[PDB]
């Protein structure tokens, strides 16, 4: 299995410059049979060619007309990454970036894959104002969120920014009926959610329920308990 | 810059067909045309490369053709899990993706469950009052949410948001009412109302906690 493991979600203030590294594991960087890409994604722009940097004896680089000017790809051997610089940034690059490996077939026919494997993708957002963590609340399960032995639970994360917020339940052990909604932007420009668990009403006495917050933007994470009142 | 139409939606069981059109110095210029699929918050995953190939795992019922600057997927027996993004790109030293075309996978109605988390004490002691509306499982995706306060419409304060893709298909969203603690105090009634097609759907809180 090839893996590749990203940089982490963060923002970056406007003029700056974006960096992010893609860490290769499972392949070597210098492949004789690859290319080490990195796309974006915005919901106005779509899929976004950055550029590419292969090794074929020599190292090479291959960049996008509009970014020809302001970026620059940097493979790591010591490492076994590469990794993305964009300089002056503006919001226009606000984006969910992803590394690629492309990939050709050198054995009996040549086949030309693509983008075979992709990282997860990190977030950026460039934008002037500051990072802040989120304040947790717990929404606490009542007589008056069960519908018939069910109960209704959750963490209101509120004020935070920027963006992403993940969320798991009882370090991840809990996942069946978590329902998590996605981000509504205030006019304050800050971000609130919600995420709610249904859970067995006849457990509340004897099961802690735990959210995990982790705001990797502000180096933050809070867990908070749900208790019932 | 190629085009593909923005939305296709089909039915279980029919066949669907994405157009991707360029021209001959991006599609037409080789057959190194590739297709991607996209489920909200994850990566794209290559399901065809060089115009008709299969990367090992993805069903038949994935298909690829080329016919002049139009290069084409195609869809047999549409599950509920092809609901998707989906796109195309081209090799010509440079990549080139088209738009994208949303893919939904028609299905019936659905009413939304909706829940009503009154503030918790935790935040009223820090000066705030948030009422949280959560309307989840509905079909199609909009409805029309309304605040009353001791029976009476409310428009200061709230924030929507637009309906958002669960992993069912279904469509979930959520409704905030901010509040001061006293306007919180000042009412024995906030209800949370949701419309959706003909139902409507209400729920209510008072403060005596």
């Known amino acids: 299995e090839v893996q590749l493991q990203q940089s982490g979600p963060g923002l970056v203030k406007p003029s700056q410059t974006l960096s992010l590294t893609c860490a290769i594991s499972?392949?070597?960087?210098?492949?004789?049979?690859?290319?080490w890409n990195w796309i974006r994604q915005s919901p106005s722009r779509g899929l976004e060619w950055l550029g590419r940097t292969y090794y074929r004896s020599k190292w090479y680089n291959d960049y996008a007309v509009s970014v020809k000017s302001r970026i620059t790809i940097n493979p790591d051997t010591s490492k076994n990454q590469f990794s993305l610089q964009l300089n002056s940034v503006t919001p226009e690059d606000t984006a969910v970036y992803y590394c690629?490996?492309?990939?050709?077939?050198?054995?009996?026919?040549?086949?030309?894959?693509?983008?075979?494997?992709w990282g997860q993708g990190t977030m950026v957002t460039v934008s002037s104002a500051s990072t802040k963590g989120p304040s947790v609340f717990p929404l606490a399960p009542s007589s008056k969120s069960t519908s018939g032995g069910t109960a209704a639970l959750g963490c209101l994360v509120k004020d935070y920014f920027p963006e992403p917020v993940t969320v798991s339940w009882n370090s991840g052990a809990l996942t069946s009926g978590v329902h998590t909604f996605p981000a509504v932007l205030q006019s304050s420009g800050l971000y609130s959610l919600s995420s709610v668990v249904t859970v067995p009403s006849s457990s509340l006495g004897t099961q802690t329920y735990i959210c995990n917050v982790n705001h990797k933007p502000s180096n933050t994470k809070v867990d908070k308990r749900v208790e019932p009142k | 810059v190629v085009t593909q139409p923005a939305s296709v939606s089909g039915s279980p069981g029919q066949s669907i067909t994405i157009s991707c059109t360029g021209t001959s110095s991006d599609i037409g210029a080789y057959n190194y045309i590739s297709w991607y699929q996209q489920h909200p918050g994850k990566a794209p995953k290559l399901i065809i490369y060089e115009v008709s190939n299969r990367p090992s795992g993805i069903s038949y019922r994935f298909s690829g053709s080329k016919s002049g600057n139009t290069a084409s997927l195609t869809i047999s027996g549409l599950q509920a899990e092809d609901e998707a993004n989906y796109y195309c790109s081209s090799y010509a030293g440079s990549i080139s993706f088209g738009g994208g075309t949303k893919v939904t996978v028609l299905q019936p109605k659905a009413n939304p469950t909706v829940t009503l988390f009154p503030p918790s004490s935790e935040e009223l002691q820090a000066n705030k009052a948030t009422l949280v509306c959560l309307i989840s499982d509905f079909y199609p995706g909009a409805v029309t949410v309304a605040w009353k306060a001791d029976g009476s419409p409310v428009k200061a304060g709230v924030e929507t948001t637009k309906p958002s893709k669960q992993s069912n298909n279904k469509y979930a969203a959520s409704s905030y009412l901010s509040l001061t603690p006293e306007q919180w105090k000042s009412h024995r009634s906030y209800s949370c109302q949701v419309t959706h097609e003909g139902s409507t759907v209400e729920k209510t809180v008072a403060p005596t906690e």
């Open positions: 690629a490996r492309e990939e050709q077939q050198l054995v009996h026919d040549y086949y030309y894959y693509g983008m075979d494997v």
């Open positions: 499972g392949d070597s960087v210098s492949s004789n049979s690859a290319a």
